RNA sequence: AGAAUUUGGACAAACUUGGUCAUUUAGAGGAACUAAAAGUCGUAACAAGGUUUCCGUAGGUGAACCUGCGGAA
């Protein structure tokens, strides 16, 4: 019993300067075998006779979509760590820049997202994956839906510093 | 044609006297009418939203990396 998991031809070379790092973990703490197809360009996880194929395969494609090693590490561990894709989909107006509002300049909207919600976003084009816990997940999600959808900063932000407080705050 | 000197010469700018004028007194009365300002400390308020990871190309190049441009997820 095997997972395939297709690596994309714009995050292969980190792979392979990376994969040293990569496969211990799954050779070792995980005890699957694992091979790259260099023709199909994908990453095979079989099990040998001697429920953590479904782990392996998070891993590597947490590290397909974008995020990097030891976020990828984090999600291997870490039991209750889930991860949320979804495109933007809700061309100059509103393509091109709502996905710049997510980002903002230097990036330090997704930066205070990322921080205020304590999950990590990796941003494509038009491809925003989250790794967090599941309310963290919910509430990086429902801020980045928000200002694609068009908030004000300051309500943004506000609801940033509010969500920061009431995800570590007991009771 | 045409110089002086000159027969008749009119026009005549500007200067002078004041105005028929407009304007200022030495400066001083009369004697209405209108106006008259007493309140520590107050800001930077003022403003937009392209990140990650590769790939090509041009330049700067230890051909590494950075920057610009063009693409991909």
Known sequence: ESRKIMVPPHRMTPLRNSWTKIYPPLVEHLKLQVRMNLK??????????????????????????????????????????????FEVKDTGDHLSRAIGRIAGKDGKTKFAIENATRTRIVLADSKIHILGGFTHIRMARESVVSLILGSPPGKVYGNLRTVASRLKERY
């Open 40 to 85: 199909t360009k994908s990453v095979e996880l079989r099990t040998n006779p001697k429920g953590a194929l479904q782990k392996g395969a998070d891993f590597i494609k947490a590290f397909t979509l974008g995020f990097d090693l030891d976020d990828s590490i984090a999600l291997l561990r870490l039991d209750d760590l889930y991860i949320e894709t």
